UniProtKB/Swiss-Prot annotation, chain A:
This is 2-succinyl-5-enolpyruvyl-6-hydroxy-3-cyclohexene-1-carboxylate synthase. The keyword Transferase applies. Catalyzes the thiamine diphosphate-dependent decarboxylation of 2-oxoglutarate and the subsequent addition of the resulting succinic semialdehyde-thiamine pyrophosphate anion to isochorismate to yield 2-succinyl-5-enolpyruvyl-6-hydroxy-3-cyclohexene-1-carboxylate (SEPHCHC). Its EC number is 2.2.1.9. The lineage of its organism: Bacteria, Pseudomonadati, Pseudomonadota, Gammaproteobacteria, Enterobacterales. GO terms for biological process: menaquinone biosynthetic process. Transmembrane segments: none annotated. The gene is menD. The keyword Ligase does not apply.
Length: 535, 531
């Protein structure tokens, strides 16, 4: 019986994932995946998640992996369902999320010969996966200990990113056929561990000349890192005396706020030319000015510390790329009290924040961005789309140390922000504020279906500047209502404060739509930038 | 010096090259780094522009335009995941043959793998799915213009079917001084010409089968699947001329003279006449019916032939036989029929009885009924866009669609992921009034393409067969589309009366059970298996 064996074959694949940390599982309905689905429904170790848009399912997985820092499975049916995993897959491969995708395949008898829901799947994602397994047609003449060891190889040696696992099943898909095959794994069925542990660690080693470099004029730059990390970096820089430029994604507390303004002042840039070393911890910097400054700074040595692989410095400084847990790194390269060498930067920053304050009253996109610690859920988290309002938050707010932030800023796609925030919220269980533009809200409209189901209040701010028949000036009321969500389109700050009060009250998602122009935002920034640069 | 003014002319040329090969429609999205191709295509007045914000949707919209018009259609997108969202349309094309030309804009290669923003590895991304893949180098006036136009010409010229992926890096930035300009004039008077630079256009076709005059006297069965509307008729003639039975699929537009095949294929008196069949000729591919699929899996004719304009094996049962690549119209001309007496005695009896069996269940307000009575609602001189959904299994099993009335489908890999936005592509290409039916699931899946359906050159009705707790009333309202949810045949007729007057999309949601529709079919399968 082909369909009894094909079930043991799947159950064997699922049980192994379980031994590498996989708890969350994302499924969508489909008439061929059934095997792996069935198999995962029987396995009591998994949290189930679903969504009918497969693109959105990949993002929802990405959300979860993002916050939980654990690997996360996705199961899908054969055909175009699979291609749709491609965005989240690509993003993961750039930021580290362990997405394990199990793609059910037609068997290889049935490829390239006109069958339904049948396409060429192995290899499908080119080099985007960290690993790609392309499982063979199931047969009892390959031992279970081969199959689990292949899974084990991939998950075990996975430092970061996605793993495509194509899973063909015989056709058509109730008795004792896979049984002694499964039995040959013995008391492995009762164990915590993988069948074959292979988890080498990838890690840069200790910089032996740190004790020299830590006495020079360095500058610290903080990118995306864990919230604990922001805090750790915050002291480590303070302890050293080096200015810290910290990015919205950093969670450092931003002890020199508004760097996108103040890096424009020649008094500032000319204090930095004097820098000998630049340690940047994490990556994906947000600001135009910080990106530019970084492109142009000259230092004797450039360092980028981060647990991701590869070049991260798009201007290609002479310097080092150090692969490490940031927190571990800082313990390994510890700071020592030295009095700060920068004297103007700290004034400029203070002043540049006074200049942003002076401009808080007007009800547009910059002021919302400036006022945004006002609106964070207590014990909450922020998620941040890829849209001017996030450059604005970075330029103009000073977000709390240690307060969690998330984003899809690997490739900064705008195609999955609602689904991702869904995952992001479901993972941690926390109240969530998520900020996004109208195109992103329209791109991923039906993940509103998702944001119905959330374990704690989620507020989605949609900044809408919108942008046979006359065009097309779209809003988000009927959307919120299509999916039974609360909606508020506050006309001013009182209405915004009220709409928040309402929204923190129950565990559902509430849409708050702030309508603004295409220019006020960019402009207030340019004006502030010009003001700050003269002072 | 000016890099920008030349990256302009590099783009201008790629686009103009395309113009020489049938491309008129270009579908585009808002984008940071595809500015250059966007702009070259805007200053170029051979193109019809179409636009959409969800790149997955765009791919399907072009799949739409290309499917109907049969001419290649270009797509432009900015660098990053916008590009990945092209995968599904690209795949489908590869199976159905649409010519999607993907211009994907890309960070220049100094910027790849170094944590630059919105930068990913693009060459290679779509693996084996496109038919030609091109990785254009970093733009320089050191590579002459003739090369770039020729590289294009070769890729378009030699393309039988499916997508081409032209990845185009541009050096940053975007003086507009004259920097491109002599470089372009080395092309000389090509610029005013109407023909490619290089004409490389081999034709691909199987040769007249020299033994047809023998097999055509044999006891043949004709299966017809997706072909053109003219084709459906030439096939309906031919099959009648020979005396062979025609099993005619919802996508065949053959008139379906032996209607309800899905019902009667399940009756022994017909399985048995079909066993007597010594040759089978299947023209087109992607058969729909569950029975016709099985029947085809187990038939054991002396020979199985498939005629289609597309390469590859198409018989997923692997019969001894032949796979002939040809335009069907042409094929029929190169293998005409000789009038001959029908060998089929019992099959026409059972299909009349089939229909008449369906007809007595024509009353109840459900999906199976709505499938059955779909011709009442066909817009006159219109086109049918059918989704991938039980309800379209019902059209094919329980209805009989008029000969040569145009159907269209995404049935290469049958995803349910871009049906609305394919539907818009389909209305816009031909200008016709258009009916489209889909499931709730489909409609949610590609929900945001309601934005495209706002925009039609003629009325579009989107019937949405919803089978349960969301309803489409507010989606329709978001996009300022008319909406109905009829509760019976009088409410449904009223809905339609309106929807035909104007160049807009009217959404019509029919609510049903998860079960009626299949029960109705099971039950009708049985009653027919008993006469």
């Amino acid at each position: 019986s082909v369909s009894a064996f094909n079930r043991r074959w799947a159950a064997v694949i699922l049980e192994a994932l379980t031994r590498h940390g996989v708890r969350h599982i994302c499924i969508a309905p489909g008439s061929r995946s059934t095997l792996l689905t069935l198999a995962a429904a029987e396995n009591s170790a998994f949290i189930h998640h679903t969504h009918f848009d497969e693109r959105g399912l990949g993002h929802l997985a990405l959300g979860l992996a993002k916050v939980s820092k654990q690997p996360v499975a996705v199961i899908v049916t054969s055909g175009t369902a699979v291609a749709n995993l491609y965005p989240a897959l690509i993003e993961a491969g750039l930021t580290g999320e362990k997405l394990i995708l199990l793609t059910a395949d037609r068997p290889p008898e049935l490829i390239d010969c006109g069958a339904n829901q049948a396409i060429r799947q192995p290899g499908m994602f080119a080099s985007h996966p960290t690993h790609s397994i392309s499982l063979p047609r199931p047969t009892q003449d390959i031992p279970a200990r081969w199959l689990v060891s292949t899974i084990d190889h991939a998950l075990g040696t996975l430092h970061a990113g996605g793993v495509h696992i194509n899973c063909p099943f015989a056709e058509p898909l109730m008795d004792d056929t896979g049984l002694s095959w499964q039995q040959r794994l013995g008391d492995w069925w009762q164990d915590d561990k993988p069948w074959l542990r292979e988890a080498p660690r990838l890690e840069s080693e200790k910089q032996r000349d740190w004790f020299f470099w830590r006495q020079k004029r360095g500058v610290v730059v903080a990118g995306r890192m864990s919230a604990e990390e922001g805090k750790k970096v915050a002291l480590w820089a303070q302890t050293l005396g080096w200015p810290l430029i910290g990015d919205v994604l950093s969670q450092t507390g931003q002890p020199l706020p508004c760097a996108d303004l103040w890096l424009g002042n020649a008094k500032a840039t000319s204090e930095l030319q004097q820098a000998q070393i630049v340690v940047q911890l994490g990556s994906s910097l947000t600001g135009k000015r910080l990106l530019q400054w970084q492109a142009s700074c000259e230092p004797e040595e450039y360092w980028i510390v981060d647990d991701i692989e590869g070049r991260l410095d798009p201007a290609h400084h002479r310097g080092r790329r150090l692969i490490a847990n940031i927190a571990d790194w800082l313990e390994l390269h510890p700071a020592e009290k030295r009095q700060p060498w920068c004297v103007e930067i700290p004034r400029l920053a203070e002043q540049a924040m006074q200049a942003v304050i002076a401009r808080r009253d007007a009800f547009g996109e910059a002021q919302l961005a400036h006022r945004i610690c006002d609106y964070l859920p207590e014990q909450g988290q922020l998620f941040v789309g890829n849209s001017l309002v996030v450059r604005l938050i970075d330029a103009l707010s000073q977000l709390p140390a240690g307060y969690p932030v998330y984003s899809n800023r690997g490739a900064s796609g705008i195609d999955g922000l609602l689904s991702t925030a869904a995952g992001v919220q479901r993972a941690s269980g926390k109240p969530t504020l998520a900020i996004v533009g109208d195109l992103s809200a329209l791109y991923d409209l039906n993940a509103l279906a998702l944001l119905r189901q959330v374990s704690a209040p989620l507020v989605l701010i949609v900044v809408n500047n919108n942008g046979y028949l006359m065009p097309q000036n779209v809003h988000f009321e009927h959307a919120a209502a299509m999916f039974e969500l609360k909606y508020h389109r506050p006309q001013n700050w009182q209405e915004l404060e009220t709409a928040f009060a309402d929204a923190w009250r129950t565990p559902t998602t509430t849409v708050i739509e702030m309508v603004v122009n295409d220019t006020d935002g960019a402009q207030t920034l340019q004006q502030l930038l010009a003001q700050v640069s003269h002072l």
